[PDB]
Amino acid sequence: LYFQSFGLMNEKFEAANTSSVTTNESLLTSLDQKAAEAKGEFAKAAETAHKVQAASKEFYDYIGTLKTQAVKGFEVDKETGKMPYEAMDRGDNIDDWFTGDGYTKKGNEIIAKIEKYKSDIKAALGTDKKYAGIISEVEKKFDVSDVKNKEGIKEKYLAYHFKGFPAIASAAKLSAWQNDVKKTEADVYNSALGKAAVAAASYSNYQAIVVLDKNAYFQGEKVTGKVVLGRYDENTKPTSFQGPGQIVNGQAVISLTAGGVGEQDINGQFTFLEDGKNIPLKFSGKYVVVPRPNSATISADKMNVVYRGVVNPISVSFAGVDANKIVASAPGLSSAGKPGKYNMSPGQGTEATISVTGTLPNGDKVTDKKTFRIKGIPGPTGTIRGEMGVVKGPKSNLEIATIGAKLLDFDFEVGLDVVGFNMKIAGQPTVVVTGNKMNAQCKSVLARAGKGDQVTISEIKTKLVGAGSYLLPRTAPVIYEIQ
Amino acid sequence: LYFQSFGLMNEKFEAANTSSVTTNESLLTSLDQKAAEAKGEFAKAAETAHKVQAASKEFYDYIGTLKTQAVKGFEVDKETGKMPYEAMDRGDNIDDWFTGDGYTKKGNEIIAKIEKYKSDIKAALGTDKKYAGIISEVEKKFDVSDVKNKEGIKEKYLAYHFKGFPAIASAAKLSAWQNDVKKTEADVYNSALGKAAVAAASYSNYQAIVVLDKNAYFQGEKVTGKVVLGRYDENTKPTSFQGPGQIVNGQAVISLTAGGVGEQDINGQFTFLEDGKNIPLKFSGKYVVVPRPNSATISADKMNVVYRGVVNPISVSFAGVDANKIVASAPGLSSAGKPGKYNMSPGQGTEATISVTGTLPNGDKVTDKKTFRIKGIPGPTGTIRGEMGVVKGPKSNLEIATIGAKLLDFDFEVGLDVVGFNMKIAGQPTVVVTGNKMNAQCKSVLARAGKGDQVTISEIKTKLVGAGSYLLPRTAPVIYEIQ
C-alpha cells in the first residue's frame, strides 16, 4: 500500500546528491588551491582527486540514465516536481535489461559500467594504505556477483535487484548508489588532502643545523647560537627567493665575494603564497670583513738598547689590538705625541722593561713586555779647533784654541761642553785647566815650545746636556803638534 | 506486495554500518597515533574527533533502540539472522511514540535526542570553515521541523515519517539515519586529521635563517653558506634533543664555554617518533678556538741599525702567520738556526731593507718590510798595556809594550789587531812603526827620555776581524807618561 515510503527514501537520497555536488566541489577546490600554492604532495593529491572526479562523474551520470528509464512515462508535477509515487508500482520500463534468465546487451552494459567504476577507482587510487578502506568499500557496495535467493539458487544481480520491482523502489535504490558514489568521492578528496599534508609535515623533511652567532672564539668565551630544524625537501617550493643563490630542495646555497671592511649583511627573503595571503620570511645574515695581517716585527737583537741621560724614542704596537686600546708603561716612559709613540729616559739600573696592555674588542686584556738594556752614553772624543787625534798648525792657533768633545755616530742630539782638561809640554809639569780655553798659565808654559813640539790635551772633563746634565767620566785625549 | 525491497534496503544499510565501525575505528587510530607522536595540532584534532565519537555513539546507539522497538515481536531466523519481511507490514510497535495529533513522553524524547546530537556535533566542532559543511549537512539531514503533507498542513516529523508505516520500512529509515551518523563521523575524523596536518605544514611555522660556513672573512674571499627555513613552532615537539641547550618553539638556544685550541664540534641530535619509526636528525656544528693576541712590537726608533763587517742577529715574526710560513729576505741575510732567527752582514750602501712574506692558512700572501741604517764600526780607542788615555809607569814597561785597540760598549765579539802606529818623543822626529810593538828605532829614540816625559802613540792602524777583515780608518791616540 505504501509507495510514499519509497518516495520519501528517494527524496532524501536526491537531496543528499544535490547537497553533495556543492560540498564535494568545495573540497576539491580546497585541494586545488593547496596544490597550486604549496605544490609537492598537494599536487600529487590533486592528480589523484581529479582521476576519481572523472570516474565518479561517469558512473553517477550513467546511474542517472538508468533512473530516468525506471521512472519513464510518469509525469513529474509542474510546480512541486515530484512523481506520482502511487502510480509507480510496476517495473515494465526496465524489462529491456533482461532476456529470459539472463541479460540483454543493455543489462551486460550496466554491469560493465559498474565494473569500470570499481576498476577506475582502484587504478586512480594506488595500493597505498591511506586508500585501502575506500577501495574495499567500493568493491563491497558494488559487488555485482550473483545473489542467492530463499531457495539458495543464484540469481543475476540486476534481475535480483530490479526485475519486476516497483518503479519508485528502483529509483530509490539507484539514488542510494548515487549517494555511495558521492560519499566515496568526498572520502577521496578529504583522504588525499590529508595524506599529502601528513607527508609535507613529516620530520623526514628536515636537516638539524647549528647556526652559531660567530664561528671563531677565544678560550673561555661564551659560544652562542641555536640548533634548528631546517627544511630539506624537494617538494618545498618557495613562491620566490631573493638572495645570492638559488633554491635547491627548499634551501638556497649562497655565495658572494666578501665586501670591503667591517660588519656586513646578507639580506633577502622567501615568499610563500598561502590561503590567499603572501607569507614573507625575511632574513639578515651577518658576516665581518677583517683586514689581512700586514705588520711584521723585524728587530736587530743586539740593538735593544736605551741610553741613560738621553730621550730614547720608542714605538709600540700590538697586532690584533686597536692602537687606541694599547697602553705602555715603564719608569722613565712618557708619550711622544703620536699614537703608539713614546719617549724613554731610563732611571738607574742595567735594564728597563716596557709593559704593554691591550684591550680586545670583547673587553679582554692582553699583556706583553720587552726589556731593554740601559747603557751609559759612549765616551766622547776630545778635540782642538774641532779636530780629533793629532791637530797640526802654528803655536798661535793653540793659544787661542777651544778644547771640545765629539760623540761620533751617536744618533741623539745632545749638548757637550768641556769644563776642564790637562795640558802638557815636555820639560814642564802638567797644567790643570778649569774651562775649555788655554790659561795664562798655559800660554807661559808654552813660551818654550816651537816647531816639532807636541802638546797633549788629556783628562778632558766633558759635561753633557740631554735629559738632564752629567759629568762624563772619560773623553779620549787629543794632541797638538806645532808646525 | 514488495516488503523484500524494504528488506534489501535495510540489509544494505546495516552492512554499511558493520563495515563503518571498523573503518571509522581505523581512521580514529591513525589520528590518535599521529596525536601521540607529533602532538601540536594533531592533539587538538584528536580532542575534536573524540568529542564527535561520543556524540555519534550516543545517537547511533539510541537509533538502535528505536529500531529494536520497530521490529518487536518478529522472530529473526536462527541461522540466517534475517527477519520475516512479508510479516512486517504494520507499525503497531511504535504507537506509543504518538498520542492523538501529538507525541507521548517517548516521542518528545526521540526529538530531544536528535536535537542533542546536532547540538553536540555543533559544540564539538567549532565555527571553523573546515567543519562548516559537515555541520550544515547534520542540520539538513536531521531537520526535525514539521513536514507539510499533500494538503499543505503541517504534520509532526515522527508522525509524518513513522506513524502507521510497515515495520520493515521504519527499520530501513532508521538504519539510513545510522549510515548518516557513521558517514559524518568519518568525515570529521578525516577532516580533523587534514586540518591539523595543513596547519603543521603552514609556512607561517618557519624563520628564514642564514647559516654561513664562517662568520669572518678577508676582502675577496668567497663567503659560503646556505639560507634555510628553520622550524619555529610551539607545536614542534621533538621526542628528544641532545645538545648544549633546551627546546623552545622547536629550536634549541645553545651555549658553551669555548674549548682549548683549534677546530671544535658541537655534536648532538633531535629524535622524532613517527609512524612507528624513530627519526634521528644528527648535527655536528663547528667552531674554532683561536689564541688571543699575545705579542707586542716594542722598538727603540734610533736603534734600527746594522753594522758593516759584523754578524747582526735579526728576529722576525709576523702576527697572524705561523712561524713556519714566514720568509725573510735581504742582501746579506741568512738563517741563524732557530725559527724566525736570522743574521745580517750588510753590503755596501747606507740602508738594508729586510722583506718579509707570510702565507696565511687560506694560502694568501702578506708582505711587510723594514729598513735598517748601515753604520760603519765605531772608531776603536788606542791602548798601551791594555790601558787607554794616559798610561803611566817606567820607561822599561813602554819599550816591551804592546800597542792595542778597544771597542768600548760594542755588543759584537770581534777581533782587533794593531798593524801600525806613530811614536813621538820631544826633540826627535816621529817614528813610523809597522807592527804593534816598539821598534829598535823606537828604543834608540827613547834613550833620551826619562821621568816626566810623555810619548804619544797616534795614527794607530787597527785591523778588524768579524765577518771579513777591514783596516779601520781611525783609532783614538794613546799617551805614555814615564814616572
Residue numbers in the entry:
A (entry chain A), B (entry chain A): -5 to -1, 36 to 513
Quote the paper:
The GldM (accession number GI: 58531935) and PorM periplasmic domains (GI: 188595218) (GldMp, PorMp) were cloned from residues 36–513 and 36–516, respectively. GldMp crystallized readily, and its structure was solved using the Se edge of a SeMet derivative for phasing. One molecule was present in the asymmetric unit, but strong contacts exist with a symmetry-related protein in the crystal. The GldMp dimer is elongated and straight with overall dimensions of ~180 Å × 50 Å × 35 Å. The dimer structure contains four domains, D1–D4 with seven α-helices and 22 β-strands in the sequence (α1−α2−α3−α4−α5) (β1−β2−β3−β4−β5−β6) (β7−β8−β9−β10−β11−β12−β13−β14) (β15−β16−α6−β17−β18−β19−α7−β20−β21−β22). Domain D1 (32-232) is formed by helices 1–5 in an up and down fold. Each D2 domain swaps its β-strands 1 and 2 with the other D2 domain, whereas D3 domains swap β-strand 7. The D4 domains (406–513) are not subject to domain swapping but are packed together in the dimer. Remarkably, with a 180 Å-extended conformation, GldM spans most of the periplasmic space, as the distances between the IM and OM associated with T3SS, T4SS, and T6SS have been found to be ~26013, ~17014, and 180 Å15, respectively.
PorL and PorM (GldL and GldM) are IM proteins that interact via their trans-membrane segments. PorM (or GldM) is therefore a central structural component of the T9SS and an interesting target for structure and function studies. Finally, we suggest that due to the structural similarity between PorM and GldM, both classical T9SS and Gld T9SS membrane core complexes might assemble and function in similar ways.
